[PDB]
Amino acid sequence: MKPVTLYDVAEYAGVSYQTVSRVVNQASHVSAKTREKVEAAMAELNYIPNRCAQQLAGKQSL
Amino acid sequence: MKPVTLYDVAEYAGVSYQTVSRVVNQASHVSAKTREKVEAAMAELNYIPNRCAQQLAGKQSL
DNA sequence: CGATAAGATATCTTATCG
DNA sequence: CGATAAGATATCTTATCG
């Protein structure tokens, strides 16, 4: 079950992954609008606490 | 400083990485003793990934 | 069936530019 | 100081062989 990736929030926010990922990791070096955009994005997409693979993994393409 | 990796468990179990890696994710087509050693290995070595961002800060210095 | 190797994707880290 | 781009590493999944 992989609903959202930090990439998803990033895209939805309109910012690089580590734009928002940096935000999610502390965001000690960013701007106002950015945090609010990522915050909005993750909020809308719900964004579960599993960007990488803490207690749930799996990935495929093509 | 870097804790266990699936490679560590793999080596310690005496099985290729891809063997135990698939084990930890399903282990559909795997023998008995194999599961025992992978499980043992990860158990003995404790096995803590930390491939995200918990306490493992310094990783690669480029 | 069980084990090994290769390919693809995501996350994080570091460096550069405005 | 802040955002973007490139590179490296690890994990996961699928296919083939004995």
Give domain limits for chain A.
1-62
The experimental method, as deposited, was NMR
Contacts by B21-27, CB closer than 8 A, 24 or more apart? B25/A57, B25/A58
User: Is strand C less than 7 A from the beta carbon of B5?
Assistant: no
Angle, in degrees to the nearest 10, between helices B6-13 and B32-44: 120
Q: How many CA atoms lie within 13 A of A44 on its CB side?
A: 12
The gap between B59 CA and D8 C1' (Å) is 11
The third-level CATH classification (topology) of the domain covering A1-62 is 434 Repressor (Amino-terminal Domain) (1.10.260)
Residues A20 and A39: beta-carbon distance below 8 Å = no
Strand C nucleotides within 7 Å of a protein CB: 1-6, 8-15
**Tokens standing for residue A36:** 């609010």
Q: How far apart are CA B41 and CA B56, in angstroms?
A: 22
